[PDB]
């Protein structure tokens, strides 16, 4: 009943015995290989711990230490970033003059003439211009020298070592047992209050003492080397009292509850800093303070050892009504015995979170000199969109794996899951209809516009000047937001963003940081295209999950396992009738959706927001509002967006952006290459490998591990992975080359 640390001593002895043996976990693998297919299986089931065994304890111990290994990898990556910024960067030069020097923290060796990639990024430096936005983070944290970056790199190196050691320790020396993992009340209490609460309180503590004064000094124009070191701001306090007078009272305001005496550096201004083009740091500090208080209270909800708190089982089984029978009764037993349920929930939430992060970061730029660094903005948005999409697809993959492997109504019965399984056909039919209707009335409008324009009938077109489809709801909402500060958020001075409205354009160094974003008919059309693509990928994934165990087609689909080729060409043909195959499609449709989203973002930003400001306040954008009139027909996307924007990357050869041109072409190649795997089947290939094997045998050079063509599932996997790599990489090259050349 009570909660304690519970461990096991030396469960597995560290040794090199199993390294010598390839696929020790799989009994069939351990023995050895007869054909080439054995090598592929070895890799495909390396991390599927729940099939190497059946013990939940062993699965969870393996999971814990694998997480430790992953954390170590992440720390090594971070330390590499910091070290490259310390040693092979122009960070100090950029710190002296941010809006003329281009950030770059990677140089290349002059081996085969590749030193042309060491382009002129300014600052007496020649390297590869980076888009990671790391310089902005380091500037917002207060880092002024490269000694601080060196110290950070070494600290992260020793942290990576610590994480690797802890991974070894918690698997080979002191491995917890099942009752320790199956405690989720204390785990939640610690992750809410300890990891997020204390973490954000600690970060607010950093910003209050390091980033606020140092960034004040930097924005006052002081030479970066003439700025006091951060620890001075802690030793000598009147240094802070000068910048921030109310540091004089010194924490007595915090206990007199005269918190208003802190109004100096704990603000609620909102908007952007007109000097840096980022959010006010005195706003971010206040934000993290409030976040910390909220999380610290929130991590006290669940009962662990002292009576007070909430039993999650009680909360769950208290919720049920007349439509759902006994809903939520039995979910606590499901979410604590199967790792795949937890994994899919967390993956869905993390993907949602990543995409929300992308949006909020484009809209409210948090770092100084980030908004006017167009390359960094574009790259960050695109990268986070892709990450979010991939995570969301993985959520569906693991929900299906749960349904196939761990769902059991004999021992772990839940009502809601059962009801959804019982009317899955109604669910999928209505989602099908919605997909069809949405596809007709969003893309059909584009086709109508294209033919109306090609028949010389622009008046009949669905445009801003012929037949207006105005997004009146979005316009109304954003006008409500523009009017918010002072009316219904009285403590704010500026609206939370500048895309809402109110005028108040902000520029930095002759470039536009932000201005109100207008929503017209093209925005309506493309938003409905977005809704359509999201609905279709949801349809595919949900159909895969709901029909993973059985269907009216094949009545015992679970016995065939979560992943399998087919069940023969019977009943008309059952190609890809498995849950894994549904995930394979969803990835295709996720690719489509995210591609359209990032294209929309890039065109709209290069057309209505970014650009150069001038002396009168005349804003010339990258494209003179060509999105409002040209984006309404597909010919406009092919001509004004792809063909026009594509010219930058094509002319990259012979300059320092040549690598982007090379990657453009190479990604085209690998994408086209995927089609060989996606259009063919393994029968032809086995029959061809047969005669190649004959040719080898004729010369006593045939191998003993018999070469087999790939499995049916592996061929689809090779085809989908190559497809995604090709498409994403060509978009990456195009975006980067274009925004670095025109930005």
């Amino acid at each position: 009943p009570e909660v304690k640390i519970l461990v096991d001593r030396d469960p597995i002895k560290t040794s090199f015995e199993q390294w010598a043996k390839p696929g020790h976990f799989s009994r069939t693998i351990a023995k050895g290989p007869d054909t080439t297919t054995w090598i592929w299986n070895l890799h495909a089931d390396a991390h599927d711990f729940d099939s190497h065994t059946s013990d939940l304890e062993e699965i969870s111990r393996k999971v814990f230490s694998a997480h430790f290994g992953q954390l170590s990898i992440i720390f090594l990556w971070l330390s590499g970033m910091y070290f490259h910024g310390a040693r092979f960067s122009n960070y100090e030069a950029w710190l002296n003059d941010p809006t003329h020097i281009r950030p770059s923290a990677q140089v290349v060796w002059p081996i085969v003439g590749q030193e042309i990639l060491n382009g002129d990024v300014g600052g007496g430096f020649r390297g590869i211009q980076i888009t990671s936005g790391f310089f902005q983070i380091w500037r917002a944290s207060g880092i002024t020298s490269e000694l601080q970056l060196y110290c950070t790199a070494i600290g992260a190196l020793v942290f990576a070592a610590l994480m690797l050691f802890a991974g070894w320790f918690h698997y080979h020396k002191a491995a917890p047992k099942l009752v320790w993992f199956q405690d989720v009340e204390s785990m939640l209490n610690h992750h809410l209050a300890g990891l997020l609460g204390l973490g954000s309180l600690s970060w607010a503590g950093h910003q209050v003492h390091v980033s606020l004064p140092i960034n004040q000094f930097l924005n006052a124009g002081v030479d970066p080397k003439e700025i006091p070191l951060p620890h001075e701001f802690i030793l000598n306090r009147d240094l802070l009292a000068q910048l921030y007078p109310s540091f004089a009272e010194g924490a007595t305001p915090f206990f007199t509850l005269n918190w208003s005496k802190y109004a100096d550096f704990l603000t609620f201004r909102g908007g952007l800093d007109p000097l840096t083009g980022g959010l006010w740091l005195t706003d971010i500090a206040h934000h993290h303070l409030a976040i910390a208080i909220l999380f610290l209270i929130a991590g006290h909800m669940y009962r662990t050892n002292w009576g007070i708190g909430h039993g999650i089982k009680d909360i769950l089984e208290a919720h049920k009504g007349p439509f759902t029978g006994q809903g939520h009764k039995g979910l606590y037993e499901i979410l604590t015995t199967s790792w795949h349920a937890q994994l899919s929930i967390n993956l869905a939430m993390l993907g949602s979170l990543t995409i929300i992060v992308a949006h909020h970061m484009y809209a409210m730029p948090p770092y100084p000199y980030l908004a006017t660094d167009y390359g960094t903005q574009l790259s960050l948005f695109t990268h986070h969109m892709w990450i979010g999409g991939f995570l969301i697809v993985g959520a569906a993959a693991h929900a299906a794996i749960f349904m196939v492997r761990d769902y059991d109504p004999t021992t772990r019965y839940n009502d809601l899951l059962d009801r959804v399984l019982r009317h899955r056909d109604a669910i999928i039919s209505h989602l099908n209809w919605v997909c069809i209707f949405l596809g007709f009335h969003s893309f059909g409008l584009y086709i109508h516009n294209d033919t109306m324009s090609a028949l010389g009938r622009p008046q009949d077109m669905f445009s801003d000047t012929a037949i207006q489809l105005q997004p009146v709801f979005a316009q109304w909402i954003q006008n409500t937001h523009a009017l918010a500060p002072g009316t219904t958020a009285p403590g704010a001075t500026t609206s939370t963003s500048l895309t809402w409205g109110g005028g108040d354009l902000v520029s930095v160094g002759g470039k536009v940081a932000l201005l109100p974003i207008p929503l017209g008919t093209a925005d309506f059309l493309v938003h409905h295209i977005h809704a359509f693509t999201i609905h279709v990928t949801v349809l595919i994934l949900l159909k895969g999950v709901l029909f993973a165990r059985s269907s009216r087609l094949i009545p015992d689909k679970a016995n065939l396992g979560f992943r399998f080729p087919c069940d023969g060409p019977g009943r008309g043909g059952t190609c890809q009738v498995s849950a894994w195959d549904h995930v394979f499609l969803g990835l295709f449709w996720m690719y489509n959706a995210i591609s359209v989203v990032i294209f929309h973002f890039s065109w709209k930003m290069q057309s209505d927001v970014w650009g150069s400001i001038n002396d009168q306040g005349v804003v010339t954008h990258i494209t003179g509002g060509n999105f409002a009139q040209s984006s309404i027909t597909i010919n406009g996307w092919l001509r004004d967006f792809l063909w026009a924007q594509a010219s930058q990357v094509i002319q990259s050869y012979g300059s320092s952006l040549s690598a982007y041109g090379l990657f453009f072409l190479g990604a085209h190649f690998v994408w086209a290459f995927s089609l060989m795997f996606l259009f063919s089947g393994r029968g032809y290939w086995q029959e061809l490998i047969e005669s190649i094997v004959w040719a080898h045998n004729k010369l006593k050079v045939a191998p003993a591990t018999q070469p087999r063509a790939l499995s049916i599932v592996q061929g689809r996997a090779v085809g989908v992975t190559h497809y995604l790599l090709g498409g994403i990489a060509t978009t990456w090259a195009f975006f980067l080359a274009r925004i670095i050349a025109v930005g």
């Binding site: 009994r27 069939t28 023995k31 059946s54």
Partner: protein, 97 residues
Amino acid sequence: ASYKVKLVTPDGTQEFECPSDVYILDHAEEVGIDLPYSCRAGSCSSCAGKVVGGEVDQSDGSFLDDEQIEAGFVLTCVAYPTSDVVIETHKEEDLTA
């Protein structure tokens, strides 16, 4: 090497000589105590038995439950007798359940 192999059987219990590099069922045929079989390739229940003492190598195994290996059952056609083990014959159905 050639450890003695004991097999309970409705015919009785006999002892035969056979080298650890060979299957118990294959040398049984050489002596001449008849046992059941069908596929002879380790993929069926026909030649099933279970063990009383010792244990046989599970390397020559396929089409078996991730448990049939350690719960007792085994296939005479695909099995190397690493010791002086005592095994059962005609054991398909109490394996078939």
